[PDB]
């Protein structure tokens, strides 16, 4: 309910052009079930990762497990008792553009660009695996490192 | 020539109230407290004591101008707990902490002097 | 003209540490050993003694107005 | 909140009518004389383009 | 000092400082963000700047046009953190949309695949009055046209 | 939502300097303690100077400025004296101020060094700090001029003055500052990354460090909060440093209680 995307990702390249920011790492990732491509900027100091790690990633539209939308303003009460308890890294952002077919191209591929407060995600792949994504829609990143 | 007197930084004038409480109208259960003739000392202690309370949601101080000895705190709490009661609780907890520190420091001075 | 009572940045009393500084300088010491012997460990107080010039000894050479 | 991947409800003839009405209402030199009209298009030629 | 109310109204309606922002000389602003304000704008809007709840709640006291609704953090777990762009987004009012480039933007990045996801965070983009991408500089907050 | 439990451990105590550690308290409390030690801790300093003979080589206000910076022993006195604004007196009551006198006339051919030993006091408990120095008869240091030099005089010059010393704190004027530098330091190993070293190997280690020689920074701990503070309070001679700390905590408690009283007074509206 409200889960737009859910997949297990392998990190295959970390900062390919060099580490440009001290507290931010860039991860290039490929999935296992749906053949996606991910570029994700994460907090390096707060949640460090190495190359070759596996992690579960869930892109949701709300933290409420019944699918109802959130209030939209922060309170330091409701971050436990929800779907964020099963994940070690929770982020919040919105889609600012969706590339791909646009109007005059085929819909074989699709790219979605999300800005988590300045940190950046590009998630690209098949267009049928990116249903429910639209511009200026707020969304939640859920991320847990696997063993 | 235009140098202000040096005692205006800590002395109230005639008919100057120390605390001016102003109710906030943008959100609910929020207040803006204006304390005259004080500085970052009391504001820093009161804010960092307020942030230990889970029943507060917003707490922040500001000195609007260095040349004006005055500072404000905005306090926004939950809907069971007044901001003024939160400011009471923060002041009382700071007083208890300072009294405990005073008696522990006196005991440490006594044992350091008697121990040689 | 004369040595200040207190260090500017620091507030440590240096008004009693000028004649002793001159005596330690004229005995055999260097300036660093004299400042270490006076107890001025911070350089904020050491600049108050290294840079100070005593202009009151030149002012005392003039005859006073009233006898 | 314009969605650029969803079909729209704007007919092109209404676009032409709105553009023509906008350019008729965006005047600089007023009047209905030949000199006034010619000075109006000479003032607003780059804006109309 | 004007000595009449008609001259006072002329000072209010013509001579006042926010009416004199744009030069008629070169259709550019005459006043820009200068000195350490500009330096700390560049140092705040970097990607690695993560700001805790306490510092955000101090910094929001100095914004009198704030609507007293706290934005939701960029990172929700394990520690709630805001970014520098997320609090600069509160400063920008209304519907302001802008795309410019930072002074160290490489020339070959625009023709590459990372045009809309900058590795160096040099493509400044503001959508709907909130800062989404880029590090601000003199090109974004100076006297230049289109800033 | 309750108070902390501050634990204090004193590492060093002497006649002019105390070094101690605060454990389990917030950083605002420690910084405010430093501020109230520097600024709002009261002491006695000379504030009312009247000159009757000033035939020396320095001006009136220069001598008043030099006399006003002299620290006075005010450990047992400052808690009982009131401010001038808080007395019913007008002509400087003994429970309001302390009278000092000076009268030095130079009649010798050599230079006369007018120091703080010539500053007599009407109160037997308020003295300049050189009462601690005149009792050292084991002077192997070689010099007996351990007193604060007010002025030098040649033959024919005189200095006669009457002064009143009042109670005040360093927020009003820096001559009422009881301390001479409060060293305040938290997290010496940079385990919290509150400051960023471009080259951590270029920085000397602090005296309160816990790292060995080949390490330069502690590993980053994002869960850490500042709860250990190293204080070094050095006195200027006006007050004992333990009295500086005790009176600073008392002034902070009085300020917070006054704020509480004013809040409860305005609450009935
Ligand atoms: Zn010093
Ligand atoms: Zn009195």
């Amino acid at each position: 309910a409200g889960v737009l995307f859910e997949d297990i990702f392998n990190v295959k390249d970390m900062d390919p052009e060099g580490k440009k920011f001290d507290r931010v790492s860039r991860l290039h990732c490929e999935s296992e079930s749906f053949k996606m491509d991910l570029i994700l900027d994460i907090n390096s100091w707060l949640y460090p990762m190495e190359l070759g790690d596996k992690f579960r990633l869930v892109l949701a539209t709300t933290l409420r497990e019944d699918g109802c939308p959130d209030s939209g303003e922060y309170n330091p009460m409701e971050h436990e008792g929800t779907r964020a308890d099963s994940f070690e890294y929770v982020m919040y952002g919105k889609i600012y553009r969706i590339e791909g077919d646009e109007a005059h191209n085929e819909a074989s591929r699709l790219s979605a660009y999300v800005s988590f407060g300045g940190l950046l995600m590009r998630l690209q792949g098949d267009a049928n695996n990116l249903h429910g994504f639209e511009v200026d829609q707020h969304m939640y990143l859920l991320m847990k490192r696997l063993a | 020539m235009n140098a202000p007197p040096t005692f205006e930084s800590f002395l109230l004038y005639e008919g100057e109230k120390k605390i001016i409480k102003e109710l906030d109208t943008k959100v609910t259960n929020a207040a803006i407290f204006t304390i005259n003739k004080e500085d970052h000392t009391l504001g820093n202690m009161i804010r960092n004591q307020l942030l230990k309370d889970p029943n507060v949601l917003f707490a922040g101080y500001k000195v609007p101008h260095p040349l004006e000895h005055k500072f404000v705190i905005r306090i926004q709490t939950t809907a069971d707990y007044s901001p003024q009661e939160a400011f009471m609780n923060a002041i009382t907890d700071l007083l208890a902490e300072l009294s405990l520190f005073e008696e522990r420091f006196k005991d440490a001075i006594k044992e350091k002097k008697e121990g040689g | 003209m004369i040595i200040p009572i207190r260090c500017f940045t620091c507030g440590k009393v240096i008004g009693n540490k000028w004649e002793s500084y001159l005596g330690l300088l004229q005995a055999e010491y260097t300036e660093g050993d004299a400042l270490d012997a006076l107890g001025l460990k911070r350089y904020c107080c050491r600049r108050m003694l290294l840079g100070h010039v005593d202009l009151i000894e030149k002012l005392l050479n003039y005859a006073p107005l009233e006898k | 909140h314009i969605n650029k991947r969803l079909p729209t409800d704007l007919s092109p003839i209404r676009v032409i009518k709105g553009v023509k009405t906008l350019l008729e209402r965006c005047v600089i030199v007023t009047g209905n004389d030949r000199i006034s009209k010619q000075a109006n298009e000479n003032a607003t030629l780059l804006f109309q383009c | 000092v004007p000595q009449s109310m008609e001259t006072r109204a002329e000072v209010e309606n013509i001579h006042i400082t926010p009416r004199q922002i744009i030069t008629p000389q070169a259709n550019k602003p005459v006043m820009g963000i200068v000195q350490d304000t500009l330096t700390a704008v560049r140092k705040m809007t970097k990607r690695d700047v993560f700001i805790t709840r306490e510092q955000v709640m101090n910094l929001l006291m100095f914004l009198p046009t704030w609507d007293a609704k706290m934005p939701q953090p960029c990172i929700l777990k394990p520690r709630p953190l805001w970014t520098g762009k997320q609090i600069f987004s509160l400063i920008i009012p209304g519907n302001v949309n802008m795309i410019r480039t930072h002074s160290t933007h490489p020339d070959e990045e625009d023709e590459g695949p990372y045009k809309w996801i900058s590795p160096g965070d040099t493509k400044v983009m503001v959508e709907h009055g909130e800062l989404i991408m880029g590090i601000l500089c003199k090109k974004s907050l100076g006297t230049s046209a289109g800033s | 939502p309750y108070a902390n439990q501050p634990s204090v451990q004193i590492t060093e105590l002497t006649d002019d300097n105390v070094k101690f550690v605060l454990e389990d308290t917030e950083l605002s409390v420690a910084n405010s303690l430093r501020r109230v030690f520097i600024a709002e801790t009261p002491t006695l300093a000379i504030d009312w100077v009247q000159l009757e003979a000033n035939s020396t080589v320095l001006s009136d206000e220069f001598l008043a400025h030099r006399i006003g910076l002299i620290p006075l022993i005010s450990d047992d006195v400052v808690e009982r004296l009131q401010y001038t604004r808080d007395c019913i007196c007008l002509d400087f009551c003994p429970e309001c101020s302390v009278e000092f006198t000076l009268d030095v006339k130079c009649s010798e051919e050599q230079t006369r060094h007018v120091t703080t030993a010539d500053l007599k006091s009407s109160n037997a408990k308020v003295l300049p700090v050189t009462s601690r120095n005149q009792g050292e008869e084991d002077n192997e240091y070689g010099e007996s001029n351990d007193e604060i030099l007010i002025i030098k005089l040649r033959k024919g010059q005189e200095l006669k003055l009457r002064a009143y010393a009042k109670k005040g704190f360093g927020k009003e004027h820096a001559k009422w500052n009881p301390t001479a530098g409060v060293c305040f330091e938290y997290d010496p190993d940079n385990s919290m990354r509150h400051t960023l070293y471009p080259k951590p190997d270029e920085w000397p280690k602090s005296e309160h460090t816990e790292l060995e020689d080949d390490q330069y920074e502690a590993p980053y701990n994002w869960e850490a909060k500042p709860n250990k503070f190293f204080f070094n309070v050095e006195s200027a001679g006006a007050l004992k440093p333990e009295n500086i700390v005790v009176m600073g905590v008392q002034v902070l408690k009085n300020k917070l209680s006054n704020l509480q009283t004013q809040l409860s007074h305005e609450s009935q509206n």
Side-chain angles (χ1 to χ4, degrees), chain A, chain B, chain C residues 1-66, chain D, chain E, chain F:
Chain A
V3 180
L4 307 182
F5 186 77
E6 169 162 20
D7 211 325
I8 304 159
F9 286 74
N10 304 290
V11 189
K12 293 182 183 293
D13 205 354
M14 185 180 289
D15 306 302
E17 297 291 324
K19 196 169 187 292
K20 293 182 183 293
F21 297 107
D22 292 348
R23 291 188 294 272
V24 167
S25 287
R26 172 153 285 193
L27 324 176
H28 295 248
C29 309
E30 290 190 358
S31 315
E32 288 169 46
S33 66
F34 294 100
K35 299 288 96 175
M36 297 298 110
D37 184 27
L38 181 80
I39 297 169
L40 178 58
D41 290 337
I42 65 160
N43 205 322
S44 179
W45 283 10
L46 183 138
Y47 206 53
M49 293 178 71
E50 61 185 0
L51 190 149
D53 282 332
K54 303 188 183 292
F55 64 98
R56 186 179 295 276
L57 185 79
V58 165
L59 301 188
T61 184
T62 185
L63 288 177
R64 298 274 99 86
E65 286 185 353
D66 48 348
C68 65
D70 290 333
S71 66
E73 58 93 21
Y74 172 59
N75 59 5
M77 294 297 104
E78 293 296 322
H79 71 277
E80 69 269 12
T82 45
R83 60 170 71 254
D85 285 333
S86 296
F87 297 96
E88 297 176 359
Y89 196 42
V90 186
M91 294 176 71
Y92 177 74
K94 66 181 181 180
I95 297 92
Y96 56 92
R97 67 180 288 127
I98 296 169
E99 268 179 355
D101 65 312
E102 291 183 353
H104 212 183
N105 290 318
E106 305 304 299
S108 59
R109 300 284 284 181
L110 205 74
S111 305
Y113 291 77
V114 189
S115 170
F116 303 101
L119 306 161
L120 296 185
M121 179 183 286
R122 184 179 73 187
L123 175 68
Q124 84 186 12
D126 213 332
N128 51 77
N129 302 142
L130 297 177
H131 274 93
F133 281 79
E134 69 184 4
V135 192
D136 294 8
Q137 184 179 2
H138 290 277
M139 65 179 288
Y140 288 80
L141 179 147
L142 295 174
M143 184 176 177
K144 182 176 174 66
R145 203 197 284 108
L146 288 196
Chain B
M1 163 176 212
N2 275 316
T6 187
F7 56 88
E8 73 177 4
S9 66
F10 53 90
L11 283 180
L12 295 163
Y13 291 164
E14 184 71 32
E16 285 287 327
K17 298 182 294 297
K18 174 165 275 291
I19 297 169
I20 304 167
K21 177 177 181 178
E22 184 172 329
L23 275 297
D24 207 303
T25 61
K26 291 182 283 187
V27 297
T28 71
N29 258 332
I32 297 169
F33 292 95
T34 308
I35 292 91
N36 288 315
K37 309 307 184 289
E38 280 303 311
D39 61 357
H40 297 262
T41 302
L42 291 184
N44 221 35
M45 292 183 286
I46 290 169
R47 181 180 179 271
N48 281 179
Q49 187 50 237
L50 272 160
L51 292 189
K52 297 190 70 175
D53 202 346
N55 279 299
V56 75
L57 318 165
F58 185 82
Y61 67 96
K62 150 173 96 175
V63 174
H65 206 290
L67 294 182
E68 310 180 356
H69 296 89
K70 179 181 71 176
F71 73 102
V72 289
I73 311 104
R74 207 180 104 82
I75 301 165
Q76 197 252 330
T77 55
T78 43
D80 45 358
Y81 189 53
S82 177
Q84 187 177 185
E85 195 169 43
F87 187 77
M88 294 290 332
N89 288 166
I91 280 181
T92 302
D93 292 11
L94 281 160
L95 277 167
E97 161 162 7
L98 281 176
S99 313
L100 180 58
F101 169 62
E102 183 189 13
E103 62 183 1
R104 289 258 188 80
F105 191 81
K106 278 148 140 175
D107 291 332
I109 283 293
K110 186 180 289 293
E111 70 97 17
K112 189 65 190 292
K113 261 176 165 156
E114 292 165 342
Chain C
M1 329 297 165
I2 206 169
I3 189 74
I5 309 287
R6 288 165 182 259
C7 164
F8 291 151
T9 72
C10 165
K12 191 194 207 303
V13 169
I14 61 155
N16 55 330
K17 300 170 184 292
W18 171 249
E19 294 293 328
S20 300
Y21 179 54
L22 286 182
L24 286 188
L25 273 186
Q26 64 86 30
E28 64 98 19
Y29 292 166
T30 67
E31 294 92 2
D33 316 303
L35 288 154
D36 285 328
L38 284 152
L40 308 167
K41 64 179 180 180
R42 276 169 288 179
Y43 64 97
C44 79
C45 302
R46 293 161 78 97
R47 76 163 179 81
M48 294 299 291
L49 269 299
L50 282 163
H52 172 245
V53 64
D54 219 329
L55 275 157
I56 207 169
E57 304 284 18
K58 299 292 180 68
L59 275 175
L60 277 183
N61 296 325
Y62 291 93
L65 189 149
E66 201 267 333
Chain D
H1 310 287
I2 286 299
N3 198 3
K4 288 186 280 187
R5 296 172 65 246
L6 207 68
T8 181
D9 52 346
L10 195 55
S11 60
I13 53 171
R14 280 182 288 173
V15 182
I16 296 301
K17 258 72 174 176
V19 161
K20 284 185 183 294
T21 304
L22 167 73
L23 292 184
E24 281 175 353
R25 287 177 65 88
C26 281
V27 298
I28 288 171
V29 171
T30 192
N32 296 115
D33 208 355
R34 294 186 295 113
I35 310 186
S36 279
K37 285 291 289 295
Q38 190 67 35
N40 200 7
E41 283 102 14
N42 288 355
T44 68
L45 195 148
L46 284 199
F47 186 57
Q48 279 167 344
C49 286
Chain E
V1 181
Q3 304 287 293
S4 68
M5 293 178 71
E6 63 272 14
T7 318
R8 188 173 177 270
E10 284 196 359
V11 168
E12 163 66 64
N13 298 312
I14 293 171
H15 285 115
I16 210 68
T17 286
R19 289 185 202 272
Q20 300 295 322
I21 295 181
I22 295 297
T23 75
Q25 156 173 352
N27 60 268
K28 63 196 279 183
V30 69
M31 294 183 286
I33 298 301
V34 294
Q35 303 277 316
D36 51 39
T37 317
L38 184 59
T39 309
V41 167
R42 196 213 78 89
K43 287 179 74 173
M44 184 181 74
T45 51
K46 287 170 68 173
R47 191 167 291 177
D48 46 53
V49 177
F50 292 100
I51 309 165
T52 68
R53 174 169 167 262
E54 301 94 14
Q55 307 166 316
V56 170
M57 279 199 308
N58 294 115
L59 281 172
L60 280 178
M61 285 306 293
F62 300 99
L63 190 58
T65 62
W66 183 46
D67 49 350
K69 292 188 288 184
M70 186 180 289
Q72 186 176 3
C74 167
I75 299 169
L76 291 161
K77 274 188 66 177
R79 192 172 70 183
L81 292 183
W82 283 257
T83 61
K85 308 183 183 56
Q86 209 165 4
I87 64 169
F88 202 88
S89 289
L90 294 163
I91 313 176
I92 303 169
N95 189 12
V96 168
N97 307 281
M98 182 275 287
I99 296 170
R100 277 175 100 87
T101 56
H102 187 73
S103 68
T104 62
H105 186 47
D107 293 330
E108 69 274 16
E109 191 168 299
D110 277 22
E111 284 91 5
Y114 306 134
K115 173 186 175 182
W116 291 104
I117 171 164
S118 295
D121 203 71
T122 60
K123 176 71 70 67
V124 172
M125 183 179 72
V126 185
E127 277 207 334
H128 206 69
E130 50 197 358
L131 173 61
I132 285 187
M133 293 177 70
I135 302 163
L136 311 163
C137 61
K138 188 146 82 62
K139 290 184 179 180
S140 289
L141 280 177
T143 60
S144 299
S147 77
Chain F
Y2 290 163
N4 307 283
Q5 301 290 284
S7 174
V8 60
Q9 183 178 2
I10 291 175
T11 60
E12 187 199 272
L13 171 64
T14 185
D15 45 351
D16 56 340
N17 177 220
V18 63
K19 301 181 68 175
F20 56 96
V21 185
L22 305 196
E23 190 74 28
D24 299 355
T25 185
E26 296 299 314
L27 188 152
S28 74
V29 181
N31 182 61
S32 290
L33 275 175
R34 179 196 67 89
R35 287 168 69 86
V36 76
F37 296 160
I38 296 169
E40 297 187 83
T41 302
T43 189
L44 287 178
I46 296 169
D47 202 57
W48 193 96
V49 182
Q50 192 186 58
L51 291 170
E52 315 169 16
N54 210 15
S55 59
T56 177
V57 296
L58 293 169
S59 73
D60 298 326
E61 50 259 12
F62 192 70
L63 267 178
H65 170 59
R66 287 190 53 81
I67 291 166
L69 283 171
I70 295 170
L72 309 179
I73 299 295
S74 60
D75 296 276
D76 302 331
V77 178
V78 73
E79 282 186 349
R80 298 284 75 78
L81 292 194
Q82 294 179 356
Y83 299 102
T84 313
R85 301 161 283 103
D86 294 342
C87 286
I88 62 170
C89 68
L90 73 164
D91 197 73
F92 302 97
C93 67
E95 297 173 353
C96 177
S97 72
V98 176
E99 179 177 5
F100 286 81
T101 50
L102 196 143
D103 202 353
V104 182
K105 181 175 180 61
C106 175
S107 61
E108 304 96 357
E109 69 274 16
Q110 70 268 14
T111 308
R112 173 71 151 87
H113 285 189
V114 184
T115 69
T116 47
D118 301 330
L119 194 59
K120 309 300 184 189
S121 64
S122 75
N123 208 320
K125 291 182 182 293
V126 183
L127 273 80
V129 74
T130 65
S131 63
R132 94 199 199 279
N133 299 108
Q134 287 182 327
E136 294 186 349
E137 297 181 359
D138 55 337
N139 206 350
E140 288 190 357
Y141 182 63
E143 295 147 329
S144 72
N145 285 119
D146 300 311
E147 296 171 351
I148 295 91
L149 174 75
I150 294 173
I151 209 173
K152 306 183 184 184
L153 306 185
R154 57 165 316 150
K155 188 169 73 175
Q157 308 190 128
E158 63 180 359
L159 181 60
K160 186 173 179 69
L161 59 95
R162 206 169 36 93
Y164 290 160
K166 296 173 175 295
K167 172 179 172 173
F169 36 82
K171 194 169 183 180
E172 191 173 358
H173 196 274
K175 74 187 178 182
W176 279 296
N177 206 327
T179 190
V182 185
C183 315
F184 164 75
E185 175 185 14
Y186 65 96
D187 197 30
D189 308 320
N190 208 29
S191 67
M192 294 177 70
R193 296 304 190 277
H194 271 185
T195 187
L196 210 69
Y197 295 153
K199 283 182 69 67
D201 46 348
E202 283 186 352
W203 284 84
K205 299 181 182 298
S206 178
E207 62 178 359
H208 318 286
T209 192
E210 286 197 329
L211 298 173
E212 67 273 16
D213 297 282
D214 52 350
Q215 293 179 356
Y216 290 130
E217 282 185 354
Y220 173 56
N221 200 351
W222 59 272
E223 274 175 328
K225 296 294 184 290
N227 51 355
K228 192 173 187 182
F229 306 96
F230 304 93
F231 274 82
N232 193 355
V233 177
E234 180 179 3
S235 171
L239 293 167
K240 290 185 177 182
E242 59 268 18
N243 296 336
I244 295 172
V245 179
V246 162
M247 292 179 184
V249 177
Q250 273 167 21
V251 167
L252 267 189
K253 281 156 76 208
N254 291 341
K255 284 160 54 90
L256 285 162
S257 69
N258 200 4
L259 206 54
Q260 178 168 294
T261 304
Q262 287 299 308
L263 193 76
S264 184
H265 186 273
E266 65 89 20
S267 305
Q268 310 312 301
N269 274 314

